Homo-oligomer: A and B are copies of this chain.
């Protein structure tokens, strides 16, 4: 199987006067390349994929693919949908626009059954050639892809090579890798990056990496080399910022943090997302000064 692993970033999408700041986007992706990141994930949840237009989603994949040409950094494009026909289309679009793979979230809101989740992902898997990473975040979708369904898709569809887990469920990650160790388990929960990697996970898709890509990079590569003491040390150091980045729903804190660090020009969200409270803004602003934040 073809795979995409290592330290990966769920890219924020900066806005300037309500439009996608394309030059900011490219500069942030380059900031990622130059700080040890192995792959960038455009138009995911952290990128406010829900409120983007298809030309903006398609444009930001193109910006990512183009910025990454000439590097080992791969483009794992966000291409999920709660409608199978749209998820297949976005998989085809990313594949035809140069993405090295796709990250496909479980259908949200319409709560498909385990049988329905299998047929949904098989439809995507059979529709394109690029690797496909399952994305399970039940707290946002209303549904979970069970361990059985994840393993079945990994064994039945060749392009499906693993799953980004944001389940806060270390038991499920044992369960997953204990019955199918050839799968690529990706951490979708920054605070528990090391515990997931330590059990055989082969990478992370991080929100924290947006601000401190060097430390997320170092953590993952320390861990992949089984230097578990150094990997755990960064994990422990990162805990305060890993948590504070979820004082409010992602990506409200990270974009607040990016603005505070001067890495984006404006603190703009598309509704229903909005700037955090004044309290959390102060909490985000304080925890930051305990970390060394890289620039461009």
Indicate if the CB atoms of B45 and A271 lie closer than 8 Å: no
Cα distance A121–B117 in the bound complex, in angstroms = 31
Chain B residues lying within 8 Å of A115, measured Cβ to Cβ, are 274, 277
The reply to whether B272 and A50 contact each other, CB–CB distance below 8 Å, is no
- Which segment of A23-31, A91-99, A105-113, A182-190 sits at the interface? A105-113
CB neighbours of A48 from chain B (8 A): 110
Judge whether B84 and A119 touch: CB under 8 Å.
no
Which residues of A234-278 have CB atoms within 8 Å of chain B's CB atoms? Answer: 248-249, 252, 270-274, 276-277
The 8 Å CB contact of A252, one of B84, B113, B123, B277, is B113
A116 touches B50 (CB 8 A): no
Q: What's the minimum C-beta distance from A157 to chain B, rounded to whole angstroms?
A: 15
Interface residues of A in 102-151 (CB under 8 A from B): 107-113, 115-117, 119-120, 123, 139-142
Indicate the size class of the contact surface on chain A: 35 or more
Which of A83, A116, A141, A272 counts the most B-chain CB atoms under 10 A from its CB? A272
Residues of B within 8 A of A198 (CB): none
Contact of A45 among B84, B107, B110, B276 (CB under 8 A): B110
Copies in the complex: 2
Contact of A120 among B85, B117, B119, B271 (CB under 8 A): B271
Contact between chains at A113 and B249 (CB < 8 Å): yes
B142 near A110: Cβ-Cβ < 8 Å = no
Residue contact B50 to A110, C-beta cutoff 8 Å: yes
Is A270 a contact of B84 with CB atoms below 8 Å? yes
Interface presence of A59 (CB below 8 A):
no
Contact of A112 among B82, B83, B107, B273 (CB under 8 A): B273
User: In the bound complex, do residue A141 and residue B272 qualify as a contact, i.e. CB atoms below 8 Å apart?
Assistant: no
Instruction: Kindly identify which residue among B51, B85, B142 contacts A139, using a CB–CB cutoff of 8 Å.
Output: B142
Whether the pair B111, A249 counts as a contact (CB closer than 8 A) is yes
List B contacts of A139 (CB < 8 A).
111, 142
- Check B120–A82 contact: CB distance below 8 A: no
Do A50 and B271 touch (CB < 8 A)?
no
Contact A51 B84 (CB under 8 A): yes
Chain B residues, Cβ within 8 Å of A117: 272
B274 in contact with A109 (CB, 8 Å): no
Q: Is the CB of B51 within 8 A of A249?
A: no
Interface residues of A (CB under 8 A from B): 45, 48, 50-51, 82-85, 107-113, 115-117, 119-120, 123, 139-142, 248-249, 252, 270-274, 276-277
User: Besides the contacts A85-B270, A85-B271, A119-B271, what 4 more A-B pairs have beta carbons closer than 8 Å?
Assistant: A82-B109, A83-B271, A113-B277, A120-B271
